[PDB]
Swiss-Prot record, chain A:
Functional summary from the UniProt entry: F(1)F(0) ATP synthase produces ATP from ADP in the presence of a proton or sodium gradient. F-type ATPases consist of two structural domains, F(1) containing the extramembraneous catalytic core and F(0) containing the membrane proton channel, linked together by a central stalk and a peripheral stalk. During catalysis, ATP synthesis in the catalytic domain of F(1) is coupled via a rotary mechanism of the central stalk subunits to proton translocation. Component of the F(0) channel, it forms part of the peripheral stalk, linking F(1) to F(0). The b'-subunit is a diverged and duplicated form of b found in plants and photosynthetic bacteria.
Covered range of the whole protein: 112 to 167 of 222
Annotated localization: Plastid, Chloroplast thylakoid membrane
Superkingdom classification of source: Eukaryota
Family, similarity comment: Belongs to the ATPase B chain family.
Protein name in UniProt: ATP synthase subunit b', chloroplastic
Curated annotation (Swiss-Prot), chain B:
Family assignment from sequence similarity: Belongs to the ATPase B chain family.
Oligomer status and interactors: F-type ATPases have 2 components, F(1) - the catalytic core - and F(0) - the membrane proton channel. F(1) has five subunits: alpha(3), beta(3), gamma(1), delta(1), epsilon(1). F(0) has four main subunits: a(1), b(1), b'(1) and c(10-14). The alpha and beta chains form an alternating ring which encloses part of the gamma chain. F(1) is attached to F(0) by a central stalk formed by the gamma and epsilon chains, while a peripheral stalk is formed by the delta, b and b' chains.
The species this protein was found in: Spinacia oleracea
Coiled-coil region: none
Functional note: F(1)F(0) ATP synthase produces ATP from ADP in the presence of a proton or sodium gradient. F-type ATPases consist of two structural domains, F(1) containing the extramembraneous catalytic core and F(0) containing the membrane proton channel, linked together by a central stalk and a peripheral stalk. During catalysis, ATP synthesis in the catalytic domain of F(1) is coupled via a rotary mechanism of the central stalk subunits to proton translocation.
Note: In plastids the F-type ATPase is also known as CF(1)CF(0).
Residues of the whole record sequence present: 63 to 123 of 184
Domain of life: Eukaryota
Protein name (record): ATP synthase subunit b, chloroplastic
Subcellular location: Plastid, Chloroplast thylakoid membrane
Amino acid sequence: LGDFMDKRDASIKEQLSGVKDTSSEVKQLEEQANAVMRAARAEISAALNKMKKETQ
Amino acid sequence: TIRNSEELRGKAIEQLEKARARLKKVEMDADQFRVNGYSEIEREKMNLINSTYKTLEQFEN
């Protein structure tokens, strides 16, 4: 009986806690990914600036 | 609380799709920018050498 009750409690607790921690991890993922996004964007447009200045 | 945990999960995944969506959109825009920058680097020394030939005709004749 203790197994069954603690088991359903552990089910709901486990799923909610995993939800919250993966949410934090994917938030870290978006911050890092958009940082590298605008960094690579600066890199490509900087290659444009480089080719402009070089042909200049 | 279970529902609202699922909802915070949902908001997190919406930020995920925002990240990937902006990744794709801006990468295609920078691709078009690469094309048009190739074009702008094509169009320069031709103008300048035609200016040189303008000076040519403007002195010799």
